[PDB]
Design a protein around this ligand. Sequence first.
Ligand SMILES: O=C(O)CNC(=O)C(=O)O
Ligand SMILES: [Cl-]
Ligand SMILES: [Fe+3]
Length: 365
Amino acid sequence: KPVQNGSQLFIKELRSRTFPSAEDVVARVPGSQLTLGYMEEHGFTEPILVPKKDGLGLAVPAPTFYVSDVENYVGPERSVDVTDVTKQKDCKMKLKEFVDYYYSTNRKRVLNVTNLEFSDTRMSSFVEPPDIVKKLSWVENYWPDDALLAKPKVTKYCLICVKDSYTDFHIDSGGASAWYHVLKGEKTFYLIRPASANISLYERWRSASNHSEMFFADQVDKCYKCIVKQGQTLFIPSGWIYATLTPVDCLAFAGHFLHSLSVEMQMRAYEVERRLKLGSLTQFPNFETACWYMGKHLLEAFKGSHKSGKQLPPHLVQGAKILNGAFRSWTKKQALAEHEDELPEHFKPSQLIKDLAKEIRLSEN
Ligand SMILES: O=C(O)CNC(=O)C(=O)O
Ligand SMILES: [Cl-]
Ligand SMILES: [Fe+3]
């Protein structure tokens, strides 16, 4: 009998496996140093661990905040997605019910909540994402507060994982980057770099009928183990393929964002996830819409480069090329139908595309 991912035996095997340490890959950085300058210099191509929250501008409740507290501020009747780790299947249930299980003295099942976005609850005011995320985020910067399309609801997640919880290898939707803060307990990440072959292997693995029977890390050269302890915050870059294991009961907060340093990888991940057709519950809503607003921003910046005679940085110009390629593919008449639903009000795609194309020609010279 083949071992299924998430099963009791798998977890035992996994705990015994040795992995290269995240030491050579994950930078340890003090919160006050994680600046926009730092991101630009290093380019956010590898995860970053911030051992203490000081300097991050991160707002979170004290460690004396419990799952019972989440129930109160979120709402006991609130429906939630619950993952049965051993089956590797998802279901729905009231939060009060999950909480009743969580506090059970003899849990039979291994169940977690890893999709609870609480920006629309009373608990929202208790959590504020790190300053660096707000500075990098496309939605935070370029999506108007008066927009008719609702902003992607991906900014404040509460994760509750019991001991022995496992989340299998995945790339986050939209190739989005993540901040992940452990309030109580600890969370182990197994991190795989999005080198081109690795992404291709991931796509082939995720699309295979027997994928829940195969340990993905067996197929790549390096899978790095990174333990994130209480009070620590991990920043995961675009496109990284990762799984997690929960060694002790864990409560954590996280958010997802897109940014200008990984336009290429963001599109690549999006293309992969579109080919996979997972119809996820964790999909990045209105990813295309965020790209459209980025596109309008770039056109404005280019126009602004003509008033100063100061050219845009090369990564933006390249970002423009990649986005403009997307806009074209999304609006070819053979395509409109499904993609038009994400177009913001008052956008004229064929004009934007032509204006961006011209501006890029001029920038190149
Ligand atoms: O909490 C976990 O173990 C898994 N979390 C996620 O993959 C995430 O927040 O995007
Ligand atoms: Cl964003
Ligand atoms: Fe994830």
